[PDB]
Design a protein around this ligand. Structure first.
Ligand code: HEM
Ligand SMILES: [N-]=[N+]=N[C@H]1CC[C@@H](c2cc(=O)c3ccc4ccccc4c3o2)CC1
Length: 459
């Protein structure tokens, strides 16, 4: 009973394009490959605008990029994030290394703690470790300051993600039915909780905005991304390519932290769930890692073209999961048409990512987890097929960390596979249930982690 599912069904009789009406507001639901790539690439900028949904106006003081309406103050606000998304990593040799280093740093902590909780045949919820973990990499990049797995106030700040999904997830009732906010019942709850955890993110980050402003005394080289965005805006204040005004630097860092922490936490959940619930893909990835790099030395980002399965799993996991099944709802700039069907200006729009990744005219074994799906005859990755899984979206509103988030999940499992052993609790029958909202996060699932051969992570 999650919205990604029910649109491909509605599509079958009514069209790859059709239009539901949620409460009052009119949704157009793009479900093909052909639908989406027409709409968002070929008619892009005609769909690059966001709903007039006022939960979006809650996010990051209303100055969010994720949820912001498409315009020229938004142009430079995306242009400045991405060209920081692209610039930070790669400006000079080893730009990636300091990032790479955090993943290893944290990977060593994860397998330490995963193994810690799991001794004596035990099993444990890997959830609250993989978010402390994933959020540290991004807090070391953004704020130059990781957080311990002791800190209950940090773990707090992270323990409300299922809320932020639900509220602004496509399929929802907090924006499109304003009549529901006068009385107790799920839809009243789910939004009031939502306004709470946005307060606590934008209070947690405008916080780091002050102290970094307190830090950077003109004779300086930016020692953070928080810094780098302020150096960016303090250079667009007292003189004259992509540079914000300060007033949006709190908001734009918030989106880049809040995004990553939630999604990359999910992604890294799902992969463990695919090793536990498909033992023999764990085996392959775990083997091919061994041969290509060795037991002798733990694996690094160099190894990537030389690891065709660990990509071919990464990608099938992406597809099968489709853990972002419906992108942050788009809206229209001017008029348009998709597969003929004429779609009026400012109409609300959804984008079904699960209906690119599960169309069985394009994707044969659609609900089978099959990584080796992505594999050439002589055994290679096959760039042709692999570049058609829809999960980061496309055209004007596509994801800007895609580049980064791939390099974070690759390492993270290239360590975890190569260092640890993952067991599904055999006493867990009725299947791995979920909890849908923007993202598809597994419900409490339990895993036993033994070390393969000592700890090589210790520097
Ligand atoms: C596996 C990891 C990730 C996935 C699957 C993912 C997926 C997505 C999706 C589906 C969207 C919406 C696209 C649309 O509405 O057209 C999006 C937007 C966004 N993502 Fe991600 N994302 C991931 C990681 C990250 C990370 C690490 C960051 C930090 C850079 C990030 C920052 C953003 C931002 C700022 C937006 C808003 C872009 C915009 O509205 O124009 N994402 N992402
Ligand atoms: N999968 N997927 N999609 C994207 C992932 C997350 C992106 C995002 C952007 C923000 O600005 C933001 C802000 C405060 C948040 C507070 C708690 C949790 C999350 C937050 C958050 O998340 C938007 C959608």
């Amino acid at each position: 009973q999650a919205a990604h599912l029910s649109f491909a069904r509605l599509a079958r009789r009514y069209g790859d394009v059709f239009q539901i009406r949620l409460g009052s507001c009119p949704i157009v639901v793009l479900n093909g490959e052909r639908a989406i790539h027409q709409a968002l690439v070929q008619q892009g900028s005609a769909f690059a605008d966001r709903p007039s949904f006022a939960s979006f106006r809650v996010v990051s003081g209303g100055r969010s990029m994720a949820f912001g309406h498409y315009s020229e103050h938004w142009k430079v606000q995306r242009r400045a994030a991405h060209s920081m998304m692209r610039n930070f990593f790669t400006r000079q040799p080893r730009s990636r290394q300091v990032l790479e280093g955090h993943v290893l740093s944290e990977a060593r902590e994860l397998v330490a703690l995963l193994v810690r909780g799991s001794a004596d045949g035990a099993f444990l919820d890997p959830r609250p470790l993989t978010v402390v973990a994933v959020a540290n990499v991004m807090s070391a990049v953004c704020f130059g300051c990781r957080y311990s797995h002791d800190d209950p106030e940090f773990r707090e700040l992270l323990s409300h993600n299922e809320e932020f999904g639900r509220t602004v997830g496509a399929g929802s009732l907090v924006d499109v039915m304003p009549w529901l906010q006068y009385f107790p019942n799920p839809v009243r709850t789910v939004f009031r909780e939502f306004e709470q955890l946005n307060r606590n993110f934008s209070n947690f980050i405008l916080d780091k905005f002050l102290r970094h402003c307190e830090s950077l005394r003109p004779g300086a080289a930016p020692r953070d991304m928080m810094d780098a965005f302020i150096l960016s805006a303090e250079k667009k204040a007292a003189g004259d390519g992509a540079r914000l005004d300060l007033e949006n630097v709190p908001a734009t860092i918030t989106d880049i932290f809040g995004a990553s922490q939630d999604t990359l936490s999910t992604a890294l959940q799902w992969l463990l769930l695919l090793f536990t619930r498909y033992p023999d893909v764990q085996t392959r990835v775990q083997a091919e890692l061994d041969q290509v790099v060795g037991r002798d030395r733990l694996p690094c980002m160099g190894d990537q073209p030389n690891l065709p399965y660990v990509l071919a799993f990464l990608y099938e996991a992406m597809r099968f999961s489709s853990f972002v099944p419906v992108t942050i709802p788009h809206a229209t700039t001017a008029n348009t048409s998709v597969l003929g069907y004429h779609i009026p200006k400012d109409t609300v729009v959804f984008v079904n990512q699960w209906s690119v990744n599960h169309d069985p005219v394009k994707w044969p074994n659609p609900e089978n987890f099959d990584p080796a799906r992505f594999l050439d005859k002589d055994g290679l990755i096959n760039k042709d097929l692999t570049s058609r899984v829809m999960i980061f979206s496309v055209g004007k509103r596509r994801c800007i960390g895609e580049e980064l988030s791939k390099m974070q999940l690759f390492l993270f499992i290239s360590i975890l596979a190569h260092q640890c052993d993952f067991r599904a609790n055999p006493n867990e029958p009725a299947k791995m249930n979920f909890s849908y909202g923007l993202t598809i996060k597994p419900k409490s699932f339990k895993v036993n982690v033994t070390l393969r051969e000592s700890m090589e992570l210790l520097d």
